[PDB]
From a paper:
A totally different scenario is observed for the binding of adenine or hypoxanthine in the SmPNP2, where the bound base displays a 180° rotation in the Y axes followed a small rotation in the Z axes resulting in different interactions within Base Binding Site (BBS) in comparison to PNP1. The binding of adenine is similar to the hypoxanthine, however, a clear double conformation is observed for Glu203 (one of them is the canonical one), in this configuration the side chain of Glu203 interacts only with N7 (canonical conformation). The main reason for that is the steric constraints related to the presence of ribose group, which would argue against a similar conformation seen for adenine and hypoxanthine.
Here, we characterize a newly identified isoform of S. mansoni PNP (SmPNP2) employing a combination of methodologies: ligand discovery by thermofluorescence, kinetic assays, high-performance liquid chromatography (HPLC) and X-ray crystallography. The crystal structure reveals this property appears to be related to the substitutions in the active site that induce the locking of the gate loop.
Numbering used by the authors:
A (entry chain A), B (entry chain A), C (entry chain A): 3 to 286
Amino acid sequence: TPVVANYENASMAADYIKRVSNVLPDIGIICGSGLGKLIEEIEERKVIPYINIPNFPKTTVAGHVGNLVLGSVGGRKIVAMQGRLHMYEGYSNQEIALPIRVMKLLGVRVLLITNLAGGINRKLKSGDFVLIKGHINFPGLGLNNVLVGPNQDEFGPRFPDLSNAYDRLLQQLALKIAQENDFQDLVHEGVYAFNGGPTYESPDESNMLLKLGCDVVGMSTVPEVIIACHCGIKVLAVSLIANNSILDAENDVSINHEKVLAVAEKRADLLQMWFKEIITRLPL
Amino acid sequence: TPVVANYENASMAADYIKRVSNVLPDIGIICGSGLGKLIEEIEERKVIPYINIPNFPKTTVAGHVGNLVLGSVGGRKIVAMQGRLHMYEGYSNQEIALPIRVMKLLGVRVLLITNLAGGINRKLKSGDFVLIKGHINFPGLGLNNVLVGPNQDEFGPRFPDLSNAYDRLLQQLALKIAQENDFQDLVHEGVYAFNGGPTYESPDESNMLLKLGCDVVGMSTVPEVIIACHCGIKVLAVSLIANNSILDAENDVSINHEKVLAVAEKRADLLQMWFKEIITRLPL
Amino acid sequence: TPVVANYENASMAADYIKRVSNVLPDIGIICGSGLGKLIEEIEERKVIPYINIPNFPKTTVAGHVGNLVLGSVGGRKIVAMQGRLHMYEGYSNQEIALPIRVMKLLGVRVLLITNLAGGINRKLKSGDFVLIKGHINFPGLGLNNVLVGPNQDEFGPRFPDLSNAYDRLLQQLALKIAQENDFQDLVHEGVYAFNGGPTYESPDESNMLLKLGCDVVGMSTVPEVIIACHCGIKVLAVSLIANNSILDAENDVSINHEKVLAVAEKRADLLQMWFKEIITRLPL
Ligand SMILES: Nc1ncnc2[nH]cnc12
Ligand SMILES: Nc1ncnc2[nH]cnc12
Ligand SMILES: Nc1ncnc2[nH]cnc12
């Protein structure tokens, strides 16, 4: 009744999308806030508002942009989510999962994701990038995993294994490209902690995450990764570090969304170029 | 309106059960998947589908077996749940609690529980058993405890103490019987971490649970233990170890439900015999 | 439809309150159970049952007292919540937040909060007080933060920073007053862990909280602190220690609500006097 992310409902959305554009995409992309410039450069693009697509989640309470964009990047066919859905806004498990399962039915085999996040590991500075190699899902441990509910068997198994959720060869490709352009000094690898949000982590929470072996903390990405891994889509996820929360606690410095967006502004053009090349070089 | 697990609603279920069978059970049992063979050996048994019992939770979305079975084991009178309710399927706190409170009103004084779980402690191997001596309830710490909601005063207190939830004399009895049959080399004791599920723990989550002093991790049992302790029912809970998740992470080996069920097949007959004897020897 | 804690709904409640009493309060207070004697000493007081105020949450399932009390303490104008709302009772994020946002619209600039809690740090004894200097919010990390949902922009920002949620000058004032009355030997400072509840922490959970750097654990206060910090209200929060859970685990001693209330009885008159003086000395 609130629309389950099942096979029938995802197929109705895919059918509408397929007859309004001619694109069969191979690659899906979800971009962090302030990091979406690539979506404006999509060639021969079709913009489809969420509100026009059967069974897509209602987003008018939050407002702001919400479109699916289809077209070509680097000669590859892609579908993009413009205006991300975050669980701290109150969206349900079924609302998060439906767009990813629609990507699957359209033919997406690889999903590329970027986000903004806080740095925990003392090696991370403002403006650095982290290739995510694993995660700690505090909502999942505490009975709010994105897959709680009946399993949708056509998409995947009841009990997924997440050992390979972050594709190893895609991490090596993203690192190689940073080396060819001489910005590998900005690129780290690390473990991502999912904090449901929307408050930033307190100083004592940051210090707990350091003891637990977390390198980065943020409020997104893990739900989409789990839905993708469930249905067999490979994932690359990159965090842009806004601040080092441990260092900020030692110096009594606050974090705010204005400072976050300025960091996004500083790195946006480098990230757009990086991901355009990753898309171009991605293995068939 | 979704049916609260209160005194009136539990009594209507108990009244139907009492007039369809003649069994006043003293012992309740909840068996892990693939571990239910004992329930087929119940003597002079009465099988009651959940769907026939007033106020029992609806389970048709998930499908598969769901019956209450009453009868005799080892000369003792028992009630069994055949087809367990798990919180990762989306059942509410009230749906989990009602069958246990029905057991209470029928006269159950001891609840025996088995499950499948992942090994964290490096001493545990595939096929070992763990007598649970305590737990870490990540859903409870994070506002999804099975008792969140109004308290049902006829069953127990607002703020239960869980210091004695896992009965010490029942652990010693289960260990004694393993010694008399010379399989005590398979039996450990340990602390159980509740992961809401349904994804298996990621490698970085497993390594966090090791740092936190957890010996075993699984997706069930803690909700039923808490409802039982609330209303004064003594508990014995045993985990069958499917794999050692820490060792699997070091060697890059995946876990899947097929491997889990094969372990259950390998130990099912030993576990049935063990629990039949525990039931026989249980103190009045 | 379950009544959102938005600007329009909070203003209707404030408007009713404002025309039934003549008090424009500067200070809000929320008192722990057994710790409410100060509210009976409020001078020229007006008692307003929650059930009479537009948009206030329904509390008849739990029963027991629920009033807002307005009047004067130490020459200062205050509003008190008599009968606290706890999230383990099943109240929603919107029900917790609405009374605090009503306090804001009435003119409250400082919120004083007391609670009962378990001691983790080995320096804490039954009957001690802890000035809270920071927190670890396990519900917030696990997608049950009090602010999950649409943001109410008139009250505060989408992503609050909690670095200064516990006002430093108010902690120094409360400590100074304990020194002037020679009971500073009872007063500590510490980090508070929020356990959703309503079961007390198990022995293995207590030992985990010790490893994570928590000094005290309880079932309240963090939700109200976060709503207050969101809308710019300064906070002082004090825990009264009922028992030391680590020492109790080593000696196999149970905790129960009866023992908790006896500790509250033993300290109630000292706490009332302390807070009356804090209220008197609070900076304009
Ligand atoms: N410190 C931080 N900076 C940016 N995004 C975040 N998400 C969570 N914590 C964050
Ligand atoms: N590794 C594992 N094996 C079996 N059951 C589990 N439940 C949670 N983790 C598990
Ligand atoms: N041990 C304890 N004593 C009193 N209140 C508590 N709240 C949580 N744990 C507590």
